[PDB]
């Protein structure tokens, strides 16, 4: 109920499972974005070399 | 204090990030995260709008080694020759 | 408890809200006081002109220089990631039975 | 005495008594034979495991499905299946109890001939009947009119009935159901690296399909969501302790029912099958068939199939008539339940196939008595 | 200037030159589009095979028939069929030769409208004529009076003509011919287990129907002979080498012509259609229509249809008047032969539909010029 | 610019230019690392030996195969394999040469993702393509239609093609080829007393299998002949000077292709895979798959395999139709040869995956541009 009021969702329609799945996908996209940025910077440095 | 809404308009046409917008009265709850962001003492990050406007806007409208052979037979001859 | 007491997640939500308020000006979606949880999934939709850099990659590229504490953000979201896929109803029914 | 209902479907055999609300003996229809070398002598090493024992011991077995697309290919295996469901699971004497059987329409006749001959000469009942599954589903629904789509594990068939009259020319059979979905899920699970090649792994892929898969309301938007983010991915635990995670294959697997070209079949989807079954009937009854689309079978256990079915039929039908999908929560066993309705009716008691009729007419009375 | 005669029937396009006795180009009217994935680059992979090439490569193709029950459903496919029969088969310029056309009676008018529009705006001839097929069959029969039952692949129609006068109110149409027989034959072959579901397999069932099926002289006695002894059973060789055997299905397939309730139609048989077509005429002219039952079409190519037709009409008609069936051996091409007779006639030259008449009158002169 | 063909199979990398007859660099794909303590200092002791140097110096090395059943497990080893086959074998710059790689069907997609990403970002090309090996074998055979059985060192896969059209639902994969034959021969040479346990001894058992083994025409008669008299026994000389003599293991070892239950696999043999791949297709092409059984790969190089597989398919197929195995004398390198015709084809030049398209579309174009 506190997280339903926190994320401004309907309390009778919030499920914790899709909330945590959205956070799981957001963390996976976060790590994939960091990995792609690191690979892009490494390949740009290798191309400049 | 509406610090999040105090953003300058952009010069160029921007690619629309689609989202499901909340109602305002739902966002002004007591336990709301956006209510804690609406306090001016919270930590705010100033974005660099110049690079976002730069990138995510819409776009607008010699004879060294001469040979008489072809390259396939010449490279086959190079493989044949360089093993000697 | 980690979602309710996260420090960097409201920082990132105000950052994406300011970027969207820049980015969706002149439309019905602009001038928003808040948005749903599914906005973070669609961040790879906004591509650059070269179709190489998404908006998430550029936000973390800017966050690597100016505000590195946003890179502490998977630590707060590790326990939601571990908690995902757990059905509360079946374990509560098993405990009640 | 009290009659028996034995839905001997392609995937799961559901047997039980008449006048009951739930099928007492539900177990899958497989025959498991050992393929490795037995070294420990004694302790009763059976050469053929049938039913739940084949399921529990499947790591050392070759599992054979005796029914393929509603057609019994192996008859000794189905004799073993009938022996297990009569003597071991239900624990009944078949010579003093009538037994109702279920069959898909547009079946080869010699299959019905051999079922009649075996059930009167090996499992010799006092009486029996062979019934269309869609009529039993409509009798389970408690209504007289409607069109029934029934999709088991081998056969997806559409039968429309108006006021107790079934139109035979509008009955449409499609050989695409849950076993083809399981084989297509085997084919698409190799993209993620998970190799499932054995017959034992077919049950694991079937359990993945039962527990995690769902019918998408819009397929292209769900592909766009799966390509964008990994939010709808879900994890499953294998019996060796390995944890897999699947994404778009949750809804690409049941989409073969709506798009049969995934597995190479030229035929149209089940919504087009339903619509062509409606349009082959008379014009005066179609309004009754639009509002009473009854679904049955375990292939309609995906929790997104009714809204997709209503959306596709509402796109197909004219908009001035109501589309309503009758999807009860117990439509998995409804083929059993309406049989338990039909075996307990007083008006059914003269419609039995007695032993005297079989003895005077050979195994040919099933073509003239059953529909 | 030699005219062209192009019978664009439902079954097979039969085109050729006027004054000849046999048509030069007989080829089936299908359009075949590939459905699987092409991997081999180059060598002219056409996206649509038309005619004989679609027949000879049908194992990788979806085949579409442009005509359904005498009505052209798909028009781009018919444009491809007309381009194939003009440019590839006869190899003639259409703009220098007239081209006769054939049409079933009780057709919706927009088919004739779009026929006129395409033949004067895409395949623009100096002249054309659209004719009733039964009138052409009577012209090839060489007699002025008679009633013609013409049964193609989509339309079975009865037209009586007395002394060159065709009575319009007695003309009858029934939407039951050879494609519906092929559909019913695919339905009843599933009793013996041979599942023919694809569009390619429809041609195999059509070849089975052309080679093996026949009209029974009595139907219940042939049930007695077929059920008693296996003397009538015939084997057929499939293109994969498998050999099938069919029994009573040889004569159950054409009896849909004499009993339309097999495929769920309320209408009466073709003999009752002929008797009601004769009885709707005047009482004076019924005697000549009894003695001149001319028949045409490929559906009249079963080797038992004339004696059954004579038996049913002689049972229906009063016995004092003579019943005779006129069945020439070349009645398959008799529509083309009658078109070649009518095209070469000197009195037909003022009856042409010219380019100038079309330009002054729109595509509406075909209703007032033709019958 | 000339193109490169590089069949990077499980066992032997076969690489060369386009338009050439024979693959110039044929060498096995192994990475060898030392496992003992080196006491001498100086004169260039390398930490990793790739190719023929690992074969010559194998008595002090652990050899690792980077590819297992067509799926690359170790990627730094495969990077070194590609580095050796570009820089040291062909002596070419990959930045100025297009490259056609081969791939087995039903491969995991992330394997193709990593092939595209490493091939475009370590050895960055102007263009590169990933093809199916069976399509290249049909290119080498010089015919358009046929079923191709390819059997390399890790994957035996069956793909049927008719008139340029591969049927994707009929493609079958079996993870049984020459490496599993080598491991089974290591298992069964222990019966005669010869012990082989190391990775270097796998090469000696592979040389025994390449030099002495042959496919029996009839297995039971050959077992009876080898048990009766020692006429089938043959001798071989080891590098330590010991002379071995083997009997039934000459034809028990390739029999695992026809009997996969020798190594504990549930799946059927290659003849049943070929027959089921033909029977999964549409019917009208099946005759053209019987006369064009194209074989490829080094596993089908035993001098008894064509007559045996002809016997097995002729037992399996209907007898009214010809079976013809297309077994060329150069079927070891036929994947490379058909890659050389496809690389030299004029129409193939639009189907390259250019570097610009890779930069625009990420590493995702290889799912949609390739097969
Ligand atoms: N909860 C579920 N979710 C999705 N699919 C299911 C579920 N339960 C069963 N199924 C599928 O439906 C089939 C059961 O339908 P049913 O008509 O009982 O088959 P049968 O009677 O032929 O054994 C099974 O083969 C299974 O693949
Ligand atoms: N020898 C035959 N025996 C039986 N049926 C035939 C024979 N030849 C053709 N048919 C059937 O008759 C049809 C051809 O009739 P046709 O007069 O060409 O019809 P249409 O011209 O309207 O297409 C074919 O579809 C075929 O099924
Ligand atoms: N002459 C031969 N006789 C029998 N087997 C052979 C012969 N030559 C090669 N082989 C076997 O076939 C394989 C070669 O097939 P190939 O397609 O080149 O494998 P890869 O391409 O994966 O290295 C080798 O692993 C070897 O075991
Ligand atoms: Mg069922
Ligand atoms: Mg005709
Ligand atoms: Mg290979």
Curated annotation (Swiss-Prot), chain A:
Transmembrane segments: none
Cell compartment(s), UniProt: Cytoplasm, Perinuclear region
Tissue: Widely expressed. In the kidney, expression is apparent in podocytes and some tubule cells.
Taxonomy, superkingdom: Eukaryota
Domain commentary: The WH2 domain acts as the DAD (diaphanous autoregulatory) domain and binds to actin monomers.
Disease: Focal segmental glomerulosclerosis 5: A renal pathology defined by the presence of segmental sclerosis in glomeruli and resulting in proteinuria, reduced glomerular filtration rate and progressive decline in renal function. Renal insufficiency often progresses to end-stage renal disease, a highly morbid state requiring either dialysis therapy or kidney transplantation. Charcot-Marie-Tooth disease, dominant intermediate E: A form of Charcot-Marie-Tooth disease, a disorder of the peripheral nervous system, characterized by progressive weakness and atrophy, initially of the peroneal muscles and later of the distal muscles of the arms. The dominant intermediate type E is characterized by clinical and pathologic features intermediate between demyelinating and axonal peripheral neuropathies, and motor median nerve conduction velocities ranging from 25 to 45 m/sec.
Function according to Swiss-Prot or TrEMBL: Severs actin filaments and accelerates their polymerization and depolymerization.
Subunit comment: Interacts with actin at the FH2 domain. Interacts with DAAM2.
Protein name per its UniProtKB record: Inverted formin-2
Residues of the full protein shown: 891 to 939 of 1249
From Swiss-Prot, chains D, E, F:
Biological role: Actins are highly conserved proteins that are involved in various types of cell motility and are ubiquitously expressed in all eukaryotic cells.
UniProt signal peptide: none
Subunit relationships: Polymerization of globular actin (G-actin) leads to a structural filament (F-actin) in the form of a two-stranded helix. Each actin can bind to 4 others. Interacts with alpha-actinin. Identified in a complex composed of ACTA1, COBL, GSN and TMSB4X. Interacts with TTID. Interacts (via its C-terminus) with USP25.
Chain positions found as ADP-ribosylarginine: 173
Cellular component, GO, one term: actin filament bundle
GO process terms (BP): actin filament bundle assembly; actin filament polymerization; mesenchyme migration; positive regulation of gene expression; skeletal muscle fiber development; skeletal muscle thin filament assembly
Organism: Oryctolagus cuniculus
Protein name, UniProt field: Actin, alpha skeletal muscle
Short name of any one Pfam family annotated for the protein: Actin
